[model samples]
Target: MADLELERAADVRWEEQAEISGSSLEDGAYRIKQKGILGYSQIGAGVYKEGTFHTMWHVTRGAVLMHKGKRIEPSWADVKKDLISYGGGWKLEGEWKEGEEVQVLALEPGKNPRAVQTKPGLFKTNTGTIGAVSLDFSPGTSGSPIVDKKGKVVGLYGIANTEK
Candidate 1:
């Protein structure tokens, strides 16, 4: 066997630096945006239901995800199951409690673990109503998952009242 020194190119990373445009495709941020709601967690699940998820960064078929420092793009076979009918969000049917510990799963960029307790009283998410429970995080989350301690998802975490 002969020794061969292959010329290696500089290592690169996505979403490292940029102005964060929605649709510029300048090879930076915004390139990993979820065009619309892909779908649920796995096959045979309903929207706003449990054991499912609203995946982002899924612009086309066979979407790629930055997991454990690896760009893993699952094929359509494994992608269709995650395709949801709506792009807004999901809510697992269940009862919430005040002062309950809820895990805040952020989908912005990094998978940071944020937790907060539910607010007192009913949230009543409907006409004029937002959530059944309020998030206690200092900096309100844009869009994320609020999971309960029982490993069951309670609802999607997001600040309703925004600065006008």
Candidate 2:
């Protein structure tokens, strides 16, 4: 079998904004906007393995658009800030397995996969907006496309959030 191919939904909106604090007197607040999709699939022959599977994860990194939309890059410091900022609602469009339409309830908050000491790219289900599913990805799995309930690409897979 060939590796599964995923695509992100076209309507997905990607944007960024700057956050400034009056306590600090510097040139100006630094911010960056990044928008993209994260995707992944499970294939191979294992006892628990079944057919090819895919889904929408979360936002891992953030970036900004520069050079008249020609250049898109991370806001460096801002990316760090967004990671820990919770309560922000971001939605994804993608396909879900049979009877899995409510999978969104499965996602929970825990720690940022990239910052975890044991598993850097793995998401843990101990805390977050959703409080059920905890997902983790392999090294190159980042930026994979997400699928919607009708088997359509919607967003991308992102790493977990770890703050405090």
Candidate 3:
């Protein structure tokens, strides 16, 4: 079910990833993307986990998330209690049952994003193609919400791109 939806939204439009300062990416027929295993890099965009709030942006060199036309920042305390611990890793905040159907709600900076879906545990998850889903996803669509069939936010950046 999820696999069918994932393939339904396969348009690429990355403008960040693999640049001197900032950028995105694209691939032919397939587009996979990588993300920082831990922590976010902006302000307005953030995540709420374990009763705490976090600024998706880096405190020092970061961008703030714009909410209701306001900039949102994670307090010093927010980082201590909410953000991922030192060192980066895949620290998702949801439960995934093998063979379950899931969708990725991708956000396009200026416009609404799409809910791309995929079937987890149905393909390899190393650093390449997964179930013919093509590791060529776009990077401009990061911070998008990975949700379940019931419209629940699960995680983000579940593509094949890896860290350098």
Candidate 4:
């Protein structure tokens, strides 16, 4: 079943709950449920030291970290140059550029959760810039962690531009 595959792939053991479904990454990324009327969802990185989860503040404008049907509140959040530091937030070290390979952990609708290594297509978004990969993000892809080649998470996946 999906639980078995989740463990095998990322060592994450998925626990079933009513209307609760999401995924996690080995480093710290977690899928959080949005608490707004828009029905948005996203991924967050748990920073143990900060004692909170970090993610994109846009899609998660009104949200909290949900795991196993429990509510993990956002301790703090701030938007700086298109980056939102949720909770006390985790550190984003290192740097990457366009065409450089980066790993992204995302859960798209109708698709099993997984990490994809891809290049960033940077463009103007919000205050400064945001990265977009070839894999178009759906409702559940926002806040996905973008890991650099050095294994450092650089940014969270936001919205995407779709064209036929």
Q: Tell me each candidate's RMSD, in Å, in order.
A: 15.5, 18.8, 14.7, 10.6
What TM-score would each prediction reach against the true structure?
0.32, 0.23, 0.40, 0.55
40-66 per-residue lDDT for model 2 (tens digits): 332110000011122222232222223
Full-model lDDT for every candidate: 0.30, 0.24, 0.33, 0.47
Best by lDDT: 4
**Candidate with better TM-score, 3 vs 4:** 4
Superior candidate under lDDT, 1 versus 2: 1
For model 1, which pairs clash?
Answer: 34-57, 38-83, 38-84, 39-82, 39-83, 39-84, 41-52, 41-53, 48-91, 123-132
Q: Quick one: ranking by TM-score, best first?
A: 4, 3, 1, 2
Pairs clashing within candidate 4: none
Candidate scoring better on TM-score of 1 and 2:
1
Backbone Cα, N, C clashes tallied per candidate: 10, 30, 22, 0
- In order of lDDT, best first, we have 4, 3, 1, 2
On residues 31-85, what C-alpha lDDT tens digit does candidate 1 reach at each position?
1233225521211111122222232222323333332243434322323333321
Tens digits of lDDT, candidate 3, 82-107: 23211123234554443455554454
